[PDB]
């Protein structure tokens with residue numbers, strides 16, 4: 001494992017070392033604006049298998065192909081609707097992933113055996129450079145062991161994968177902190193498959209209201225066209241309890257619960273915006289933008305400690321909050337206490 005630290009002035013020879021790894025069929029973990037990704041060359045069927053092996057990822061849970069040029073979209077997908085071309089122009093580079101029908105060129109291991117492919121153009125210099133210099137499209141899910149919280153720093157990637165993968169590009173902590181929004185363009189209206197770093201209200205204001213996949217609300221699925229729909233995700237070792245409702249009524253139940261669980265002989269962690277004394281505490285922030293940026297960090301911090309149970313302070317679904325609440329709920333296994 002070579003760990004390459006690149007700072008905002010990108011020493012291109014550094015990226016080239018990782019480029020080489022990609023062309024050679026090896027694994028390279030890289031930052032995006034969203035979360036750290038675990039890359040292989042998307043055109044190399046065998047390289048992509050290593051992604052699945054390394055993570056312990058079920059073969060039918062697809063990967064998202066990352067691109068740096070609009071030209072490459074035409075290469076990876078067939079029958080692209082003009083409305084997908086339009087969203088692409090408008091939101092790329094950025095935290096939006098489009099599901100489209102796939103071309104012959106795309107190996108089925110990438111798509112989890114399907115005719116659809118998921119594509120995105122990341123808003124991160126490093127990731128773009130890595131793809132440009134790599135001269136390959138890069139298949140990548142989140143750079144974490146399957147089931148576990150997503151990585152928002154090279155540290156997180158290293159705690160899961162140092163000595164197991166060829167390369168980690170350290171670009172620091174990711175700016176948004178939650179995964180890209182995934183929308184299915186194989187039907188109209190588009191279907192929200194995974195809420196994410198591009199809020200639903202940005203899409204709807206442009207194209208009107210879209211359909212929400214039941215998966216987003218907890219429906220278990222047999223076939224997934226996108227990541228983050230099938231199997232369990234984002235989850236620390238601990239049990240997680242999400243406490244939803246008005247600020248002060250929530251904070252009071254978290255006090256009740258801290259105590260009730262200590263009385264029970266358990267170490268409690270709390271993640272939220274309020275003050276609390278408990279075995280472990282992580283301050284997520286006051287804005288939802290700050291909370292999304294710290295979510296996974298906080299879940300990893302808790303996961304590196306004794307805590308038997310974590311108590312999370314919910315947020316409203318506005319903006320990034322739909323993504324944050326999607327992640328918290330799935331992590332908890334829909335273990336939800338609605339004060340209200």
Ligand SMILES: C[C@@H](O)[C@H](N)C(=O)O
Nearest residue numbers: 034036037142179180
């Ligand atoms: C790694 C990053 O690209 C992730 N798969 C996402 O879509 O957000």
